[PDB]
């Protein structure tokens, strides 16, 4: 039974890319419009880093102790390798998207049930010639919506 | 008479050039005098950094005083409650927080 | 047809706010509105505002010659709504 | 009067030097005056970065006013709707996007 | 029996995050308000470093030997990997904390019996695919109160 | 049967270099003119990376989140190792190409049935002394035509 | 009148200083005039890189005009066929290619 | 039997830290005043580096051979890991020393019988949460006295 | 007449320009004279770094002499016990230590 | 039988150095004048790199793709380790050549039958004290004549 | 009349400013004239690097002409052989090789 509060092994872990027009965050749970990418070999999602700004002051009572805060957080880079599939429309659209090069939204789903949506642009398309596989990585732009926001 | 309670970031610079009446001999013995009573008047270079939402307030304060009105200010840890006026300030509005660089010149009453 | 949006704009302390500017940024092309089109409206001294809004989706912008534009929300006008105040649409269920 | 709605990049500069009437006396006691009534007039350093396609458009607009006409421009987040002129714009066309580095001088009506 | 003077294998080592208002340093031994985090895969605590300043001066007797003093001691960065639990409230609060981004205080408890309190802000959030784990990294700010300060 | 929609091991993976005059992009499926290279030990194809440019703005209604766009995409570097074949005319032509140094076009064929065409100039020639192999690396120039552009 | 069909490397710089009749008063009211008709005249900074074989050809072409003859030139992608003259150019001969750095001042017929 | 001129396995290798007032170099052989640290897991003593100053000259007979001399020798950094044990006064005093931050002297003893004495200030305190251990390293200042100076 | 026993950080700079009477003729034959009896007077550039606690003490001592009184000071290892005066000093205040960067100009009695 | 077009294991791979006066490239196949180096442990020949120069232009019709050409190709560095031998005249000549330090020509011969000639100057002389070996490396200068030019 | 045969290191620079008679009228109409007949005279910046053995030879040759004699020199790959004079040169002697920096100003007969 797919539900949170218990760990999941992560077998399915499907990946979809948006094709239509509208708000991706309006309802990510419906796959009416998004296209699935088939037989991914592996996937490393992006990590939401931050950046530290200095805060230490002269007249502050506590000296000899550095002080700093956070600001201007940025999303990470997603990477995934699939089987090189020049027939299916998935990677055809992926490569056309890269060649034309615009920001697009995509999503990852868990056996858990919860859904994650990112948006960004692709910056690499690799290849291997031993069990042919295609590796592609994208960089995110703007605010992503994690699954925890949806869970509320 | 207002005051200045905003915090000052590390690296604020202090300069001091006392006024003397140099007059030279052939070699050495150059006579010197202390000039006026208040010879040296320290000059401070103060850097601040505030989140954008606050910045306008500080600006208005520096607008209210202009470059002709004095205000009390306490240098960090320094034993003196000096009176200082400012006539040069700039800021860098980057994305979230803006940093100001200003000069503060000491003046007697 | 354009719904009549009329009302009085007040701050949190129950007094009118002056020097305002309400903008409606279009997000989707409609039968009579192009995307990326804005329309300004400066209210009176008492905060009274009255505009005619064509049906579609807009994003409200409150430029008070001050703080940056504020995402007070997005407003959708279907062909069933009735004339009313601006705050009703922003508070309406979407 | 036209308006300037082009969006500006981080790192914009603002400079302000008030015009004051300063005279220094014997041991300090410098008389200070505000000079003109609207002494303070900010000067901005504004950089844009736009793709070449609309680059011409900027030049056209910046050509229309020359250096003798004033246009209204609201600075970012600032509580003022001011009028400002520019006369020293320059561009760095490289491959796809050109960056503009101009200076905007505030001027009274 | 939990008490010092004998080494501890370190089995339990619970992790808590403060939730209420007051002084976390007043009585960290009371878990009345703090929220526990569940099933931490791994943990690496912060590192209390310092900085070196030059003390050698031109006029000296002992020459040809460097002399540096200590100044500006700073806390390190804490990291912990836990099981991805999108349903539990603790990590929902954790991600809300990361999104909104203020300094918060937290603590770690040992089976020895004493606790350790830190304060800082979270700067990194990571994820995985197989046996999904979430990796959270935080950076401290200000002086911490170690276990030894309570031990006396 | 060579046909997409089923992944391929990629055993054959022949390599060809153009020798004639005309448009290599016109019809790479015809091997009337191009010369084959024999006994390729291993091969690594190019990497179509891009570049990131700043897109953050002052008056944006969303802050504390970086935004970067994509521009100036570039091809990567291809590398392959051959059995040292001084007698064969292919290696003689390859070394003459290195010495005289002009941009030349080449392709790689797959057992799937489709081909990939690049163009560039060679930059490195290496060797080994135990079972002698020659390692040759080239850098591409200009836009390449992927296999996807032919399948449509 | 000849032309200039050589290609230009990225990094070309454009400067523009339109001529106005500034005159300063107490509190602004700085009256402004457009001065001449075609006040502004763009100045271009152009960088090229050619192999040494045709460096002599380019140098001879630039020498033939000297610093007194105008020639047509089309700035990249810009909607104008301006006439420009040059009086400063330098070349960095290194081993195989030589890069020319030149300045191009716009002038009306 | 503890005596030099034959190698020693190095089983004991005790570590002591000064507590009283006086000259540490006066007589380190007596442990009448210093406190011992208990159950050190591993230890790496500092290394006495140097610094090279240029000596190449124009009119020297020898050319095409660089000439470099020695000047401004400095001590290294010592590090050691103990079993984390806040109960004992040893590491309590160690942490109080770190927090207050003053230069202090200490010694390392050997099964051979000779003792090495150093003086410096601590710069880090670490931890682990699997068989909990505390790692602490110091940087020396000024001249140390090696064991050879005592053997004469 | 007070003294100066504060420690000096490494990197002290020394400058010396002797005053000479130079006059050149057709082919050399340049007459040279020592000018004053004691012509060359070394000037030192000295930097210190002290914790904030006695920064006030150093500032007070430097203030007492102003820019006219001289004070004895022994340069490091140097064979002379000279008397010196200073007229410029600055400080980079941080939250732990402050560093002074002054110049000491040698004068005779 | 030594002949190209077939791969060769590379057992002999002798190394010779010039001693006489003349043109090394006139006829490298004759070993009348060159001296062999005996019992080389291993060898790594230099690799012929190049330099990439920018070619992109403003009015170039194809944008969004970098354009780079090739220029200023350079030879690599050769290295080889042999058995350290202070007796044989070859190593004596090698060290005299290093000490005097002039450009000299040398060659490597393969079991296939073709020879490769380089010219350069030596820049290192290594040693080891476990089965004594001497490691020596040279840097080339000027054009080397590859083995693929004699075959034509 | 001697000649020059020392080879030149990469990075040599060449500059050319043609003397013209520019006069600007009301609205453009800028009258331009070539000034002198052979107005364009290039100036080269040349760097060499030689071992110390022939440093004396090069220095003696450069001394013989002083700064008042012209010598023929053929710039690399350029067509016309020119005659040039120099008046400034400097050198760095490190350990084995001395590097020379000089400027060669082309002059007419």
- With contact defined as beta carbons under 8 Å apart, do E113 and A33 qualify? no
Q: What are phi and psi of B56, to 5 degrees?
A: -50, -45
Give Cβ neighbours of residue I71 (< 8 Å, ≥ 6 apart): I1, I2, I3, I4, I65, I83, I84, I85
Q: Which residues, in sequence order, are bridge partners of residue G83?
A: G72
- With contact defined as beta carbons under 8 Å apart, do D46 and D66 qualify? no
Three-state DSSP at A96 gives: helix
3-state secondary structure labels for all residues of chain G: CCCCCCCCCCCCEEECCCCCCCCCCCCCCCCCCCCCCCCCCCEEEEEEEEEHHHHHHHHHHHHHHCCCCCEEECCCCCCCCEEEEEEEEEEEECCCEEEEEEEEEECCC
Token duo for residue D72: 């209204």
Determine the Cα–Cα distance for residues F125 and J47; give it in Å rounded to an integer.
Answer: 5
| Among chain J residues, CA nearest to D94 | J58
Q: H93, H119, H122: which is closest to H25 by C-alpha?
A: H119
CB-CB: which of J53, J56, J72 is closest to G10? J56
CB-CB: which of F13, F49, F65 is closest to A124? F49
Which run of H or E residues covers position E147? helix E147-151
Q: If 0-12 CB within 10 Å is exposed, 13-18 middle and 19+ buried, where does residue D95 land?
A: middle
Residue found under tokens 């000052």: B8
Is B92's Cβ below 8 Å from some Cβ in D?
A: yes
Q: Tell if the CB–CB gap between G37 and K15 is shorter than 8 Å.
A: no
Residue found under tokens 């398309």: A125
Q: Which residues of A touch I98 (CB under 8 A)?
A: none
- With contact defined as beta carbons under 8 Å apart, do F49 and F37 qualify? no
Q: What is the resolution of this structure in A?
A: 3.4
Q: If 0-12 CB within 10 Å is exposed, 13-18 middle and 19+ buried, where does residue J130 land?
A: exposed
Determine the Cα–Cα distance for residues F75 and F45; give it in Å rounded to an integer.
Answer: 10
Q: What are phi and psi of J33, to 5 degrees?
A: -115, -20
Q: List the chains bordering chain F where 3 or more Cβ pairs fall under 8 Å.
A: A, B, C, D, J
Residue found under tokens 């590192």: E47
- With contact defined as beta carbons under 8 Å apart, do E36 and E90 qualify? yes
- Helix %, strand %, coil % of chain C (to 5): 5, 35, 55
Residue found under tokens 């790959």: K77
Query: What Cα–Cα distance (Å) separates residue A118 from each residue in A10, A25, A149, F49, I7?
Result: 19, 9, 13, 20, 60
Give Cβ neighbours of residue J46 (< 8 Å, ≥ 6 apart): J75, J76, J77, J78, J118, J139, J140
- With contact defined as beta carbons under 8 Å apart, do J123 and J1 qualify? no
Q: Which residues, in sequence order, are bridge partners of residue C73?
A: C60
Question: Which of the 8 DSSP states describes residue H37?
Answer: P
Token duo for residue C48: 């009274």
Q: A42, A40, A50, A75: which is closest to A145 by C-alpha?
A: A75
Q: List the chains bordering chain I where 3 or more Cβ pairs fall under 8 Å.
A: A, B, E
- With contact defined as beta carbons under 8 Å apart, do J86 and J13 qualify? no
Query: What Cα–Cα distance (Å) separates residue I86 from each residue in H20, I102, I107?
Result: 44, 8, 10
Neighbours of J54 (CB within 10 A): 13
- With contact defined as beta carbons under 8 Å apart, do I58 and I47 qualify? no
* Gap from D33 CA to chain J (nearest CA, Å): 55
Determine the Cα–Cα distance for residues C41 and D22; give it in Å rounded to an integer.
Answer: 46
Q: H29, H77, H79, H70: which is closest to H50 by C-alpha?
A: H70
Q: F94, F103, F77, F119: which is closest to F40 by C-alpha?
A: F94
Does K contact E via 3+ CB–CB distances below 8 Å? no
Give Cβ neighbours of residue A37 (< 8 Å, ≥ 6 apart): A15, A16, A17, A80, A82, A90, A91, A94
Token duo for residue H71: 């000047």
Q: G96, G109, G105: which is closest to G40 by C-alpha?
A: G105
Determine the Cα–Cα distance for residues I35 and I22; give it in Å rounded to an integer.
Answer: 10
Q: Which residues, in sequence order, are bridge partners of residue C16?
A: C10
- With contact defined as beta carbons under 8 Å apart, do G9 and J56 qualify? yes
Neighbours of E144 (CB within 10 A): 19
| DSSP per-residue string spanning J33-85 | S-EEPP-EEEEE---BEEEEEE---SS-S--SB--EEEEEEE--EEEEEEE--
Q: A70, A91, K62, F20: which is closest to E98 by C-alpha?
A: A70
3-state secondary structure labels for all residues of chain D: CCECCCCCCCCEEEEECCCCEEEEECCEEEEEECCCCCCCCCEEEEEEEEEHHHHHHHHHHHHHCCCCCCEEECCCCCCCCEEEECCCCEEEECCCEEEEEEEEEECCC
Give Cβ neighbours of residue K95 (< 8 Å, ≥ 6 apart): H56, H58, H63, H64
Determine the Cα–Cα distance for residues K39 and H63; give it in Å rounded to an integer.
Answer: 50
Give Cβ neighbours of residue G27 (< 8 Å, ≥ 6 apart): D36, D37, D38, D39, D108
Token duo for residue B77: 């840890």
Residue found under tokens 């005159």: G23
CB-CB: which of I8, I76, I96 is closest to E71? I96
Give Cβ neighbours of residue B72 (< 8 Å, ≥ 6 apart): B1, B2, B3, B4, B81, B82, B83
CB contacts under 8 A, D 7-36 vs B, are 10-21, 26-30, 32-34
CB-CB: which of I8, I77, I97 is closest to E57? I8
Q: Which residues of K touch G107 (CB under 8 A)?
A: 28, 30
- With contact defined as beta carbons under 8 Å apart, do H60 and H48 qualify? no
Token duo for residue J84: 């350290």
CB contacts under 8 A, C 50-79 vs D, are 65-68
- CB pairs below 8 Å between H and K: how many? 7
CA dihedral C63, C66, C67, C70 (to 10 degrees): -10
Q: Which residues of G touch D88 (CB under 8 A)?
A: 16-17
Three-state DSSP at J148 gives: helix
Q: D84, D102, D90, D98: which is closest to D4 by C-alpha?
A: D84
List b or e across J92-101, with b for residues whose CB sees 16 or more CB atoms inside 10 angstroms: eebeebbeee
Query: What Cα–Cα distance (Å) separates residue C51 from each residue in C3, C19, C43, D44?
Result: 8, 17, 10, 36
Determine the Cα–Cα distance for residues E133 and K53; give it in Å rounded to an integer.
Answer: 71
- CB pairs below 8 Å between F and J: how many? 91
Q: Which residues, in sequence order, are bridge partners of residue B105?
A: B43, B85
Q: Tell if the CB–CB gap between A56 and I95 is shorter than 8 Å.
A: yes
CB contacts under 8 A, D 37-96 vs J, are 93, 95-96
| DSSP per-residue string spanning chain B | ---------TT-EEEE---------SSS-------SSS----EEEEEEEEEHHHHHHHHHHHHHHTTT--EEE--TT-S--EEEEEEEEEEEE-SSEEEEEEEEEE---
| DSSP per-residue string spanning F50-73 | EEEEE---TT-SS-SB--EEEEEE
Q: List the chains bordering chain D where 3 or more Cβ pairs fall under 8 Å.
A: B, C, F, G, J
Q: Which residues, in sequence order, are bridge partners of residue I44?
A: I14, I104
Q: Where are the alpha helices (DSSP H) in H5-146?
A: 89-100
Q: What are phi and psi of A40, to 5 degrees?
A: -75, 135
Determine the Cα–Cα distance for residues I57 and I73; give it in Å rounded to an integer.
Answer: 17
Angle made by CA atoms H26, H30, H35, in degrees to the nearest 5:
105
Determine the Cα–Cα distance for residues E115 and F76; give it in Å rounded to an integer.
Answer: 53
- With contact defined as beta carbons under 8 Å apart, do D98 and D55 qualify? yes
* Rg, C-alpha atoms of chain H: 19
Query: What Cα–Cα distance (Å) separates residue E15 from each residue in E34, E38, E41, E105?
Result: 10, 8, 12, 12
Neighbours of F29 (CB within 10 A): 11
Q: K4, K19, K78, K16: which is closest to K45 by C-alpha?
A: K16
Query: What Cα–Cα distance (Å) separates residue I9 from each residue in E58, I55, I91, J126?
Result: 5, 15, 14, 43
| Among chain A residues, CA nearest to I52 | A58
Residue found under tokens 């800082």: E120
Token duo for residue H127: 């931890």
Determine the Cα–Cα distance for residues H2 and K23; give it in Å rounded to an integer.
Answer: 100
Q: Which residues, in sequence order, are bridge partners of residue F80?
A: F43, F136
* Gap from I101 CA to chain A (nearest CA, Å): 21
- With contact defined as beta carbons under 8 Å apart, do J45 and J76 qualify? yes
Residue found under tokens 């080879």: K7
Which run of H or E residues covers position E96? helix E89-100
Which run of H or E residues covers position E92? helix E89-100
| DSSP per-residue string spanning H88-103 | SHHHHHHHHHHHHT--
CB-CB: which of F71, F135, F141 is closest to J67? F141
| DSSP per-residue string spanning chain F | ---SSS--------EEE--SSS-TTT-TT--SSPEEE--EEEEE----EEEEEE---TT-SS-SB--EEEEEEE--EEEEEEE--SSSHHHHHHHHHHHH---EEEEEE-TTS-EEEEEEEEEEEEE-SSS-EEEEEEEE-S--B-SHHHH-
Query: What Cα–Cα distance (Å) separates residue C1 from each residue in A101, C55, C57?
Result: 39, 8, 15
Half-sphere exposure of E53 (CA within 13 A, CB side): 18
| Structure determination method | cryo-EM
Half-sphere exposure of F76 (CA within 13 A, CB side): 13
Which run of H or E residues covers position A43? strand A40-44
| Among chain D residues, CA nearest to C69 | D77
Q: H57, H65, H52: which is closest to K94 by C-alpha?
A: H57
Q: Tell if the CB–CB gap between I96 and A63 is shorter than 8 Å.
A: yes
Q: Which residues of D touch B41 (CB under 8 A)?
A: 28
- With contact defined as beta carbons under 8 Å apart, do A74 and A51 qualify? yes
CA dihedral H110, H116, H122, H126 (to 10 degrees): -20
């Amino acid at each position: 039974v797919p539900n949170p509060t218990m760990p999941v092994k992560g077998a399915g872990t499907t990946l979809w890319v948006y094709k239509g027009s509208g708000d991706p965050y309006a309802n990510p749970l419906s796959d009416v419009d998004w296209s699935r990418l088939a037989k991914v070999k592996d996937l490393t999602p992006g990590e939401l880093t931050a950046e530290s700004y200095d805060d230490s002051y002269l007249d502050d009572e506590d000296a000899d102790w550095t002080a700093t805060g956070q600001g201007q957080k940025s999303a990470g880079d997603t990477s995934f390798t699939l089987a090189w599939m020049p027939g299916e429309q998935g990677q055809q659209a992926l490569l056309a998207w890269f060649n034309e090069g615009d920001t697009r939204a995509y999503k990852i789903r868990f056996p858990n049930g919860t859904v994650d949506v990112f948006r960004g642009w692709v910056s690499s398309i690799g290849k291997a010639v031993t069990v042919i596989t295609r590796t592609v990585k994208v960089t995110n732009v703007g605010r992503p919506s994690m699954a925890e926001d949806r869970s509320t | 008479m207002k005051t200045f309670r905003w915090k000052v970031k590390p690296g604020m610079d202090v300069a001091s050039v006392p006024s003397v009446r140099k007059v030279r001999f052939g070699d050495g013995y150059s006579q010197r005098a202390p000039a006026g009573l208040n010879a040296n008047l320290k000059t401070y270079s103060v850097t601040l950094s505030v989140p954008r939402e606050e910045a306008t307030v500080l600006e208005s304060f520096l607008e209210e005083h202009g470059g002709w009105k004095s205000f009390l200010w306490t240098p960090p840890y320094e034993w003196r409650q000096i009176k200082v006026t400012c006539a040069k300030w700039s800021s860098r509005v980057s994305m979230l927080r803006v940093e100001f660089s200003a000069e503060f010149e000491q003046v007697v009453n | 047809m354009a719904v009549k949006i009329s009302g009085v704009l007040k701050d949190g302390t129950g007094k009118p706010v002056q020097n305002c500017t309400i903008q409606l940024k279009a997000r989707r092309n409609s039968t009579t509105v192009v995307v990326n089109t804005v329309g300004s409206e400066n209210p009176d001294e008492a905060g009274r505002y009255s505009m005619d809004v064509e049906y579609g989706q807009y994003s409200v912008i409150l430029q008070v010659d001050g703080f940056p534009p504020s995402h007070a929300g997005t407003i959708t006008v279907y062909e069933d709504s009735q004339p009313g105040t601006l705050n009703d649409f922003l508070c309406a269920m979407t």
